[PDB]
Ligand binder design. Sequence first.
Ligand code: K
Ligand code: K
Ligand code: K
Ligand code: K
Ligand code: MG
Ligand code: MG
Ligand code: MG
Ligand code: MG
Ligand code: MG
Ligand code: MG
Ligand code: MG
Ligand code: MG
Ligand code: MG
Ligand code: MG
Ligand code: MG
Ligand code: MG
Ligand code: MG
Ligand code: MG
Lengths: 48, 108, 148, 39, 195, 74, 56
Amino acid sequence: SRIINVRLISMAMTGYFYTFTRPRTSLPMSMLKYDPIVRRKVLFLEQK
Amino acid sequence: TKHPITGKWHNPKYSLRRQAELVKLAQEHGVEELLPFTRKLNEEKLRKRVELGLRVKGTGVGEKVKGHKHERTLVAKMEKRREAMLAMPDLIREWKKVGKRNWTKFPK
Amino acid sequence: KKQYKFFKSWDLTGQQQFSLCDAMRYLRAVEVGQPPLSVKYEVHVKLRTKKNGPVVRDRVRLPTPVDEYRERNGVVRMAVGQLGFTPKQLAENIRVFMAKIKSDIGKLDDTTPKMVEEVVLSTTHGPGMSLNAEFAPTDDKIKPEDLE
Amino acid sequence: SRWDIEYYRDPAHRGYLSHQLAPGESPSLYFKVPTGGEK
Amino acid sequence: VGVIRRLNVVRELLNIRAGPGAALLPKEVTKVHMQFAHRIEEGHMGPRKFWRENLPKLKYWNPAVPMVINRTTDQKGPAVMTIYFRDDKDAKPSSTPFPTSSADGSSPAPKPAQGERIVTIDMKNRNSSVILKEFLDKTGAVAVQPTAKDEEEFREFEDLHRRSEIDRERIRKMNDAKKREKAMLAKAMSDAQSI
Amino acid sequence: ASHRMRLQDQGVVVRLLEDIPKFGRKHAIFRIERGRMRNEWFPKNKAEYMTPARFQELGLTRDAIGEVDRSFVI
Amino acid sequence: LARRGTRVLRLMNNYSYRETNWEIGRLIGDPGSVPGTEKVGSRKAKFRARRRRRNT
RNA sequence: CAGUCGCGUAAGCGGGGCAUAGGAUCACAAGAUACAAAAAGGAAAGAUCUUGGAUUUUUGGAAAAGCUACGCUAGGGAUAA
RNA sequence: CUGAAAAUUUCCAGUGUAAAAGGUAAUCGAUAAGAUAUAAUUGAAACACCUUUAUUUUUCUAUCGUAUUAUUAAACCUUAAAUUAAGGAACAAUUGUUAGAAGACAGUUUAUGCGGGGCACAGGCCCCAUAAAGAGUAAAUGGGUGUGUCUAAAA
RNA sequence: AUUCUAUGAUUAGUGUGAACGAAAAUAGAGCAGCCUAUUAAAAUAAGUAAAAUGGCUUUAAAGCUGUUUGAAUAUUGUGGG
Ligand SMILES: [K+]
Ligand SMILES: [K+]
Ligand SMILES: [K+]
Ligand SMILES: [K+]
Ligand SMILES: [Mg+2]
Ligand SMILES: [Mg+2]
Ligand SMILES: [Mg+2]
Ligand SMILES: [Mg+2]
Ligand SMILES: [Mg+2]
Ligand SMILES: [Mg+2]
Ligand SMILES: [Mg+2]
Ligand SMILES: [Mg+2]
Ligand SMILES: [Mg+2]
Ligand SMILES: [Mg+2]
Ligand SMILES: [Mg+2]
Ligand SMILES: [Mg+2]
Ligand SMILES: [Mg+2]
Ligand SMILES: [Mg+2]
């Protein structure tokens, strides 16, 4: 209830995602991750 | 045959199964030319195939395959992925400028 | 006591719509002798929109001058042409208005896409008549005719 | 079937239906050979 | 505002195609012109009713002929109408110049072309009826007859006005009774305040 | 509203034979509740069932079914 | 413009023609750096422009 | 090893945290793969890959309260008086 | 919000109970006058008339719902060889479906471990000692307030 | 065509599991077709097919079925699978 599991969706619209945890009383996660479909590092944003 | 007095179709005196027994029996004795018209005749089965051919859904004459869902949406799928990458540099510039804390545009 | 989130949408199954040419034949008769420069058409387009949603406040530069339009309550009212407008000129003068709307709708959010329900046409002294997508007259005897 | 027709309809396998194709046509009953150029 | 509300209000106003003044003019005619005053004085009421009652019924069956009006403030102006009856046996002349309607007499009766012969018709202190018949008999035209559906249109809306007027007075009797009763209540409150 | 509702009967088609008042005139086809036809009209010979065979002898078709006229008067 | 506008359709499978994802990723630039993170301008160029706007 | 990112002059370092304490499958839910598609064209329902929601705490993982002195059977000096 | 006819929309000011917007400068007055409107005044917003919408309220219609009342006027039910009789009555009753509900009745579970069993208590995993100088090593053996976590690196 | 025996088959498939479990086809035993049935029957099939719902069977189809409802008219493509 204190922590949640969030899905970071690839902004390349390839359908790959990363799953991390973070507290509820925090801001959504945004990271620069590696997309294995296009084989490049793109921007990953939280699903919701 | 449709009875004249009563508007009802009477089944044929010989069912489709019995029609094949006479054709298979009349062909072994060379008397297939005397049997009346029948959809089970060896020449009728072959003439109908050569004339029209395969008419099943998709692979029939004049029919076109529909394609699987993942095949119909293939071009539109690769065009969406291509559109996102082209806009990738402008999206990271706005992200690195605005910052990870002040970012507010998230997928839905 | 009760409340709804929508604008009343009536049933159009029994409506009597008119083609653009057949309609002008009815309107041009009621405006006989009226100054064509001071008598202009008008169109009211009812939209299936929610009351809470936003409103349209865009502008449009029609081909032929008669522009600003605004949605007040599930409808948009604006002139589209003077009385002396020929059906060819008046026709495209409407297509430019419907497209600019449908372009602004799609430009809007996807939460509640406002779809059109009916299109009305009237003059400054004429009755409000419904419009059908057709353009040519149903009567084979009459043909496109232009005059004062 | 689609797969069976496409198999014997191409020249790579020397299918007995390959004569029904054109020099540019593809064996697939759905896909086509895109065109090259700038337009 | 239902669809049938707007529908009944329209189909009633579509009497333009009816018996009173409708008729299919011949192809011999080319155009029409009329000029009268604004007010109804010195013999000017006739043309007005002809313009609001029967004239619109001509443009429906004759939407190709231009029927223009030229109003003015001079109440003594000659309320006369011209009919370009002759088209030179349908020679199709090039009568390009032609005015447009107005309200200050800015579009008077122009001179006809060589292949045109106008027909003058005076109207002053005369009823629209005598003016109408003078238009048909002179400009020989066949009168269109209505269809059975049009007879139902007249019969239906006619019976409707019966129900309407029956309700106009009814609802009127409830409001005045209330406006009267509520008036009594106001009087009572005023009397109470005085005491 | 829903994609499936309760299954209901609309009535039985009958052709009057004695000009019943408040329902319809003689030789009038319409759908009436099965209770009245089965207990009141059929015993008294006031109407008759319109079977597919009866439709052919009378020359009419299934598209000739009318409606009940409550305002009927003798 | 020519790089981002090119489209190489290949014969991946089932006689289908499409653009490989790894190529779609290399339209923005060659691999090794993330486009957008690189500074478009130079710090020296910004200093020169800061004086120009001040001189005027 | 391949792929592509960060930091560093460089060498090089990085496949979470100084180390040792967080349960499967099934079913269910969200993405991807293009495998198969029960006449055929599709689809459904399946298969592979990634991921989530568990005092399954008897924690290799049953949805589960008592009396018998009316008691019964199979066994135990493997166990009391 | 089933639809139809008709009507209704009052903060101060305002000719006055301004529904809103859009368009318009004339509209009505059977031939004689004048009433409306525009103007001007008031106000944030100014009016006839033609249109399309908004709120509210009557009747009709449509749809539900309850009570009441009648019924050889042959539903059904009760007495009655069983009737143009008497009474009840669109209830009751029966069938199907739905929800609730009695261990009244049925099947099964209620475990195992434990210096006998009952009651009680215990069940995965981590650190130290016992442990005999590799590793491992038990007891209802000694130590712990052990544990089902925390953590995105930002003014 | 039906019936019996074996193979197909500890299969497809269902089932959380434990388990359950076809058909096509093949071989053999027999073989017989018809409505003018070698015993005397049809004017070609309507409250039927089918649907919702409660069950059976079963792989979700097909088949059986209480309740409430309820079609069409032949390859010149009507009906079922
Ligand atoms: K298939
Ligand atoms: K040791
Ligand atoms: K199996
Ligand atoms: K079934
Ligand atoms: Mg009923
Ligand atoms: Mg265990
Ligand atoms: Mg273990
Ligand atoms: Mg005792
Ligand atoms: Mg012992
Ligand atoms: Mg009684
Ligand atoms: Mg019990
Ligand atoms: Mg040792
Ligand atoms: Mg067997
Ligand atoms: Mg078990
Ligand atoms: Mg049959
Ligand atoms: Mg059945
Ligand atoms: Mg089926
Ligand atoms: Mg069947």
